[PDB]
Amino acid sequence: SKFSFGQATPRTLLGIIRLSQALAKLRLADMVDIDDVEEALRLVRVSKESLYQ
Amino acid sequence: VDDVTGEKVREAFEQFLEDFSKVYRAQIEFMKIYDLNTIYIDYQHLSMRENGALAMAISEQYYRFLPFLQKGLRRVVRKYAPERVFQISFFNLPTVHRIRDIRSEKIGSLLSISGTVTRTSEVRPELYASFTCDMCRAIVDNVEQSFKYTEPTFCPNPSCENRAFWTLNVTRSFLDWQKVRIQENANEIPTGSMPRTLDVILRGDSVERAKPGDRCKFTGVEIVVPYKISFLACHVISIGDEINELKEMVKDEHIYDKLVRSIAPAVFGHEAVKKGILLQMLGGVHKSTVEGIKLRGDINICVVGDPSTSKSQFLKYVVGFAPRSVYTSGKASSAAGLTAAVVRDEEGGDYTIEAGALMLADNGICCIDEFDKMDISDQVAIHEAMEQQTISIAKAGIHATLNARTSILAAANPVGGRYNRKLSLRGNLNMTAPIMSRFDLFFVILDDCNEKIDTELASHIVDLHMKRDEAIEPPFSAEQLRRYIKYARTFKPILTKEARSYLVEKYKELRKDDAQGFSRSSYRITVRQLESMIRLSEAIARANCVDEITPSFIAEAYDLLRQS
Amino acid sequence: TGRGSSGVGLTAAVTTDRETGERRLEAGAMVLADRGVVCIDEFDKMTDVDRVAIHEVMEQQTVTIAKAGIHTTLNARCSVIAAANPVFGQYDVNRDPHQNIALPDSLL
Amino acid sequence: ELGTSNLNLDARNLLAYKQTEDLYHQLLNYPQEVISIMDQTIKDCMVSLIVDLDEIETKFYKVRPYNVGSCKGMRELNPNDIDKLINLKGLVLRSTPVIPDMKVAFFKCNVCDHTMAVEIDRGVIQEPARCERIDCNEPNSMSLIHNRCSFADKQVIKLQEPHSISLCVYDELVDSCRAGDRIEVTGTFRSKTYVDVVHVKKVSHNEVEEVRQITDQDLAKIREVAAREDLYSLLARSIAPSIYELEDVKKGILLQLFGGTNKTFTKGGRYRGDINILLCGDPSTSKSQILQYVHKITPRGVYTSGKGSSAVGLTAYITRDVDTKQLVLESGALVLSDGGVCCIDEFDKMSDSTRSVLHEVMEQQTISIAKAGIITTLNARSSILASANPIGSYNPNLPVTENIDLPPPLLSRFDLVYLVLDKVDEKNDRELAKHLTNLYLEFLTMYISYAKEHIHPIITEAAKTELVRAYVGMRKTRQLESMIRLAEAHAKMKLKNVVELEDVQEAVRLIRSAIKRKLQEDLSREIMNVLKDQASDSMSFNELIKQINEHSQDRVESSDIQEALSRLQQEDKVIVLGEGVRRSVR
Amino acid sequence: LTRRYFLYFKPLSQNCARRYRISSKPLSVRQIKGDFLGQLITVRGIITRVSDVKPAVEVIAYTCDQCGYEVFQEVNSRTFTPLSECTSEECSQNQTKGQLFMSTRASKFSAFQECKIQELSQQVPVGHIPRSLNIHVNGTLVRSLSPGDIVDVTGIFLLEAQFVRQHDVEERVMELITSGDVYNRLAKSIAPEIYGNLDVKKALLLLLVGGVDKRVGDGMKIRGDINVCLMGDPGVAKSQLLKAICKISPRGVYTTGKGSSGVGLTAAVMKDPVTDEMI
């Protein structure tokens, strides 16, 4: 619709995986927890949430 | 070593020209009034003296013996006759050499080069030129012309500070010079090789006799250009059990029925299209007049219908079988792309006109695939080329017109692809009326589901898909068909009075169908369809090899026109 | 004048030599005045090369030149006074105030 | 007796001989001296055989050694290998015109009628300032004439060995080597570096390797793996294990690189087993992956892309060489890839002027250039692999022939199309994400090269009946020509020499699974209406939108309206214009 | 003339320099001082311009048919002249001075290659630009220099290279960790001269940290990188965040839209002013 833009791609899923790996790398951990994916999805949704303002 | 041999060969050449009254003395006596001095000497007529040894010694040292030959010619015309330029041309060599057999062992010798002209240049004034010095009023007249044309080695007054440099003049001196492009012929190209082209220079009055887009044969001298190996021509010409098979093939009665199924053995069905393609190849008389103008004596064939048919297969056959056949894709063409393209200021020199697809392969079939996706400019150029037989090119100040006689094989498609029966040919073909005209025959092909011939067509398609089957086997090969086409081409038949008296009633019978029409009728009938059936009459007379046509063979052409 | 500079602009002119050392430089107009003011009339006739140069020396006040032998930068803390004219020749209040300047938004 | 002065010598025979092992180890480092003394010894042993002498006393004979071992091209040619014999195997791409070289020099004087002939001494001409002192003295009166000088043939030839080496041929070997052939060549490596050819091999009981060498145990493994039933899917799974199934698409690219059968006539006919494929549908899937993977499989192919490859870049062209200051006939991308595949992405964004050359290579497989300097038809034997995108951004409410924005007869001439649409749902994309994270949790080319060069399958008449009916289902000739090449490629894999009846069944399933109105109708309907009610005058954009949302129902959004309108007009299903002005189609 | 081998050198490391208690220090091209022309130097830097391998002669061999004594002359400069006059030991005591010819086989050549070393990004001073320097290599080292890398070149300075190679702190990382909320502190620490936008610059923090490059080990490599767009209206600062990211991160290069950008994003060709070749 009117406020829409693009669609979900597998490269965005790979970028979400890469951002979760970067968040786990910033915490200096050997494993990826549940806290990184929920931060990355919040990041990619608030990256487009400013259009409603 | 040739300084004492040149006077002896000059004496031998003038003895050859003096002792024969050969036709050379009357040729000089004829040109005495016109003073052109562009003589023609046959090499076959020169090959009999000194048991051919005079011809073999001149034949390798031609550039080293050429001023002695022109001095001997000058002395014999100075003694037999009272602004002086000379041109000696040699012709009719017994061996025809290709462009791929040129080596460096024939540098400076004479050679016969045959091929096709690709491009032509403008005529230019060549120098051949007084030189002034900037220190005094000295002048010179002994000029060199090939190379080193700026530095003469002598002055009449040796008292000078610099004896080397001089200054040229454009006042006291200068004729036509041309540079054309010759290329390898299509029948003698090696397998996988490229048709290598070369530039040939030409002087004297041998210029503007070579038409662009024709097979030509030159005779000249191999001269190197800084290096590159160019050529200099002096003569121009527009060239381009067997009878036991031909006399056996003209005495039977079922030849035409095998000819209509042997002109395209790879196509199943479509006898009318094969009839028009077979009668397209050979035409009739073009000079049938008393006024003095040539007429359109050729056959124009255009194929239309739904896509995915076998109508392009004929297109792929003509070009693989007819030697005088040029094929174009239509979309990869233009007005200059089809007739004559021009280069625009490339490599330092001026403009050069390259020959396109049109005016090539005269009295042959030019086949254009996808005729309706072309532009308006090339289609009105085709209409200008069909309205008059000659074609005119006006570019860069020069105007040049030339003779052209080609038959158009136009493959077209509708605006929607599928051919609908409910309307005329004009609204479905989508092209204007003057370019729709001057077309002798239209072939409409419609397809549907008719299993009895469809299963045979699909079986022929799958039986063709194997290594060289006999499923597309004709009753006789193309080996006698090529000489039969040539023998029927040189026939020139003459129509009769009974055929004309039946033809006027047949034209009245064909025009009677226009009355209460719009059922079994789709186009108008005027003088053009009458001209089409008149041109098909001599084509069927040539195909049946009869000198005087009977109206029964024109009845099949009437039925062919009724079938369309 | 804003148009007519022999070099590449009013900074970093032509570099050539004929003596023993085959390298020589040249100073422009903006590199001479280091604390004063410079005035450019006919701003719309000034080309893009000097526009890229004043895009860089506006709020940074330094000019960097990457030559074959010279790879240094220098201070350009000066103040510019530009005078321009429209491309239409005349201007009134009823016309829009953005397209009449005929300059980019970065220069505004 | 026939006059052939050339002698072809095999060096391997000099290698295995008991007495000449010291000669083979002497000619590899110094060929220029041994060829010059071999010319004297061959004439001496020939006159010893004679003891016809009136012509062999002045005749010269040479030796062309070619039987030497292989080398690693120009990469192994180190500077210790200068002036040594070397052999290169490859293909030539460009043949320059013949240049002349001076053998003797002519010297014409301006005075005293004395001409002087001198010879070349390996590159330098001794110009005499003196003027033959028995005759009169002159300090600088001397000229040079080019037309009386004797010349020899020379030619520089471009060779693709990937590197491009400039080799140079001389007299009696000119016009024997030209672009288009697999040529073994041998000569002396010189120094910019070049190779001075002593022999060429235009043709090919020996162990000269032709194809990629296989053994008997590998052939037994190929025969044992070719007898299984699931090989038809095994290969389609082993061609790309990093991505998903794509059965029809992977099976098509597998049999596309299998090729088929290329049969010809003696003089005027040729046919190649080939399929030109096109891909269209939903984006962001493995398309580019494939477009790269195949470039990593074939040994010949170019990655041409969008508007960056025009008509001067696709086919051959002419330019200027900076290394020799001459004209260079540079090879084009369609003739650089003569054999193998060629990958094109963004087919819809490509121009219409360069579509005419691919219109000939669809089934004609030829390039016919008729321009300034060149009138040449040439081979275009490669197969295209093109990835395209639809109009907009997929729409199942629109037909397939209008959604991808292309002409229909050129697409009818396409051998294979591929609907690679996603149509996202459950249980298919979950496995997709699981397989992409499963690697985040922690023989084929030999068989293909053996099958492509060892099997020539024939299409018998026994598979006639099932083909006719497979054609009429699409008819209720390009499809028939595509399916016979598809059936012979089905016969190409699984080691078969005769085609079978079951093999076309799957082929057709292939082309039936590879391809699997209200709006515009109402649209036109209304257009017609407002035309009628306009006394045929134009329908307005506004009134259009108005009645079209007005009759409300199926919700025609003015944007959608704009789109379909655009479609019909562009379809010339409509003819209209203006900014905020709408005109009814005519 | 009979040199079968090629002689090269390599310096000592710092580990052998601290042991037994300089000669091999990592030198900049701004740290050359002029007076180091003739010392062995180890320079660190990126390589942008490389040339093709070409055979350069060292000694020219001339052969004669009159005497047989082949002579050899030694060249040192870029150019030379042909010695057409015979300087043999037999033609000095003779009236005849017969022609000499050259041999491309007995002459000793060398695989010569020129390269342009550039100054490192964080080693250049404030405001200065990374100027270049020329390195002339010969012999077997000719294929050890592939462009697009960081190298340490040890050689004499006329640059004739001899050997090439390629690639307190714990308290500084533990005091940054122990303060608590490491991610938000490192987010709000970079670029504090702007207002807010912790999310955009938080993703810029994840952008410059990069991520993990994944290799399947079967001939397929995927990206382990992020690419961030900043689409905005004017009024908020955009070049400041970009400049702070390029100033904090190493090897950050500021680009532009128009200008020489068409040749500033690809490799073009030009004529060298020091020699007759295209680079």
Kind plus residue range of the DSSP H or E element containing B402 = strand B398-403
Query: Residue B153 and residue D569: Cα distance in Å, rounded?
Result: 79
| Contact between residue E228 and residue E265 where contact means Cβ atoms under 8 Å apart | no
Bridge-based pairing state of the strands B390-395 and D263-264:
unpaired
CA distances from D325 to B73, B502, D319 (A): 44, 73, 10
Q: Which residues of E touch C66 (CB under 8 A)?
A: 129
Unique residue bearing structure tokens 């490389």: E50
Question: Are E186 and A22 inside 8 Å of each other by CB?
Answer: no
* Closest among D371, D285, D297, D364 to D332, alpha carbons compared: D371
DSSP string computed for B309-320:
SSHHHHHHHHHH
Bridge partners of B232, per DSSP, are B201, B221
The residues near D333 (Cβ < 8 Å, ≥ 6 apart) are: D302, D304, D309, D313, D314, D315, D342
Residues 6 or more apart from B495 whose CB is under 8 A from it? B537, B538, B541, B548, B549
Range of the domain at B184: 96-124+176-240
D584 Cα to chain B: minimum distance (Å):
21
Give how far the C-alpha of residue B349 lies from the chain's centroid of Cα atoms, to the nearest Å.
27
Shortest CA distance from B313: residue in chain D: D477
Tokens at residue C84, please? 């321009």
Residue where the block lists tokens 């429209």: C86
CA gap E11, D577 in Å, rounded: 79
**Residue of B97, B308, B325, B456 best to disrupt the D interface, most CBs of D under 10 A:** B308
Q: Give residues with Cβ within 8 angstroms of B21, minimum separation 6.
A: none
List the end-to-end C-alpha distance of chain E, in Å, as a whole number.
32
Q: What is the CA radius of gyration of chain A?
A: 13
Residues B330 and B411: their CA atoms lie apart, in Å, by: 9
- Say which residue the tokens 């500077």 belong to: D79
Q: How many domains does chain B have?
A: 4
C-alpha–C-alpha distance, residues B509 and B556, integer Å: 15
Residue B92 CA to residue B156 CA, distance in Å, equals 46
| CA-to-CA dists, residue D487 to B323, D229, D253, angstroms | 36, 18, 14
What amino acid occupies position D250? K
CA E220 to chain centre: 29
Q: Does residue B475 share a domain with residue B369?
A: yes
Method: cryo-EM
Helix (H) or strand (E) holding D63: strand D62-65
Asked if residue B365 and residue B311 are part of one domain, the reply reads yes
Give E-chain residues touching D242 at CB under 8 angstroms: 216, 218, 220
Contacts of E among chains (3+ CB pairs under 8 A): A, C, D
Do residues B340 and B221 share a domain?
no
* B147 and B33 co-located in one domain: no
C72 touches chain E (CB under 8 A): yes
Compute CA distances B101 → B96, B179, B217, D150, D372, whole Å.
10, 22, 15, 19, 24
Q: What's the per-residue H, E or C state across chain E?
A: CCCCCCCCCCCCCCHHHHCCCCCCCEECCCCCCCCCECEEEEEEEEEEEECCCEEEEEEEEEECCCCCCCEEEECCCCCCCCCCCCCCCCCCCCCCCCCCEEEEEEEEEEEEEEEEEECCCCCCCCCCCCCEEEEEECHHHCCCCCCCCEEEEEEECCCEEEEEEECCHHHHHHHHHCCCCHHHHHHHHCCCCCCCCHHHHHHHHHHHCCCCCCECCCCCECCCCCCCCCCCCECECCHHHHHHHHHHCCCCCCCCCCCCCCCCCCCCCCECCCCCCEC
Q: Tell me the three state secondary structure of residue B380.
A: helix
Asked whether residue B274 is marked as a ligand-binding residue, the answer is no
Chain breaks in chain B (C to N over 2.5 A) after: 21, 82, 128, 173, 226, 240
Same domain, yes or no, for B482 and B335? yes
The Cα D470–Cα D270 span in angstroms is 25
CB contact set of D173 (below 8 Å; sequence gap of 6+): D197, D200
Is A14 within 8 Å of chain D by CB?
yes
DSSP 3-state percent helix, strand, coil across chain C (nearest 5): 10, 15, 75
Residue D226 in 3-state DSSP? Answer: coil
3-class secondary-structure state, position D210: coil
Gaps in chain A (C–N > 2.5 Å) come after which residues?
A: none
Least Cα separation, residue E129 to chain C (angstroms): 5
Please give the structure tokens belonging to residue D537: 């005058």
CA dist B311 and B322 (Å) reads 17
| Start-to-end CA span in chain D (Å) | 84
A and E: number of Cβ contacts within 8 A: 40
Residues whose CB is less than 8 angstroms from the CB of residue D95 and which lie 6 or more positions away in sequence, other chains included: B194, D155, D157, D158, D177, D178, D179
Radius of gyration of chain C (CA): 17
**Token couple for E191:** 């670029």
Q: Which residues of E touch C72 (CB under 8 A)?
A: 127-129
Residue by residue, what is the 3-state secondary structure of D311-338?
HHHHCCEEEECCCCCCEEEECCHHHHCC
Contacts of B277 (CB under 8 A, 6+ apart): B263, B264, B301, B314, B318, B409
Shared domain for B8 and B135, answered yes or no, is: no
CATH number of domain containing B198: 2.40.50.140
Please answer whether residues B178 and B202 qualify as being in contact, where contact means their C-beta atoms are separated by less than 8 angstroms. Answer: yes
- DSSP string covering D447-471: HHHHHHHH---B--GGGSHHHHHHH
Question: Strand, helix or coil at B218?
Answer: strand
Tell me, yes or no, whether B508 and B560 share the same domain.
yes
Residue ranges in B221-333 assigned as alpha helix (H): 242-249, 255-259, 271-280, 311-321
The domain boundary residue, chosen from B77, B95, B113: B95
Find the helix packing angle between D502-513 and D478-492, rounded to 10°. 120
Task: Looking at the structure, tell me whether residues B268 and B247 fall in a common domain.
Answer: yes
Q: In the listed set B240, B258, B288, which residue is the last one of a domain according to the structure?
A: B240
Specify whether B102 is located in the same domain as B149.
no
CA–CA separation, B301 and D115 (whole Å): 68
Q: How far apart are CA B297 and CA B284, in angstroms?
A: 5
Nearest to D360, CA basis, from B321, B413, B328, B336 = B328
Residues B302 and B193 in one domain: no
In chain C, residues with a C-beta closer than 8 Å to the C-beta of E258 are 48
Question: Do D284 and A10 lie within an 8 Å CB cutoff?
Answer: yes
Is residue B118 part of an annotated ligand binding site? Answer: no
Burial class (CB in 10 A: 0-12, 13-18, 19+), D400: middle
Compute, in degrees rounded to 10, the torsion defined by CA atoms D257, D260, D265, D269. -60
CB B232 within 8 A of CB B146: no
Phi-psi region of B23 (alpha: psi -120 to 50; beta: other; left: phi over 0): alpha
Residue D433, phi-psi category: left (phi > 0), alpha (psi -120 to 50), beta (remainder): alpha
Residue B333 annotated as binding site: no
Sign of the CA dihedral running B58, B59, B65, B70:
positive
B200 and B339 housed in the same domain? no
Sheet with D277-280: strands ordered across:
D303-305, D341-345, D383-387, D277-280, D416-419
Structure tokens at D207: 């162990």
Burial class (CB in 10 A: 0-12, 13-18, 19+), B315: buried
Q: For residues D564 and D398, what is the distance between their CA atoms, to the nearest angstrom?
A: 10
Q: How far apart are CA C29 and CA C48, in angstroms?
A: 17
Please tell me the distance from the alpha carbon of residue B257 to that of residue B556, in angstroms, as a whole number: 12
Under DSSP, is residue A39 helix (H, G, I), strand (E, B) or coil?
A: helix
- DSSP, res D113: T
Domain boundary among B214, B240, B266: B240
Contact between residue B409 and residue B315 where contact means Cβ atoms under 8 Å apart: yes
Residues of D in Cβ contact (< 8 Å) with A11: 284
Tell me how far apart the alpha carbons of residues D69 and D84 are, in angstroms, rounded to a whole number.
13
Under DSSP, is residue B528 helix (H, G, I), strand (E, B) or coil? helix
Taking the C-alpha atoms of residue D504 and residue D485, their distance in angstroms, rounded to an integer, is 10
Write B394-401 long-range contacts (CB < 8 A, 24+).
B395/B342, B395/B351, B395/B353, B396/B122, B396/B350, B396/B351, B398/B122
Parallel, antiparallel or unpaired: strands D327-330 and D317-320 = antiparallel
Please give the Cα distance from E158 to E136 (Å, whole number). 10
Same domain, B564 and B529: yes
Q: Do chains E and A touch (3 or more CB pairs under 8 A)?
A: yes
- Quick check: D437 contacting A, CB < 8 Å? yes
Per-position b or e across E130-163, b if 16+ CB within 10 A of its CB: bbbbebebbbebeeebeeeeebbbbbebebebbb
- Contact between E43 and E27 under an 8 Å Cβ cutoff? The reply is yes
- DSSP calls for B159-204: --S-SS--EE-SS---EEEEEEEEE--TTS--TT----EEEEEE-T
Q: Which residue of A has its CA nearest to D284?
A: A9
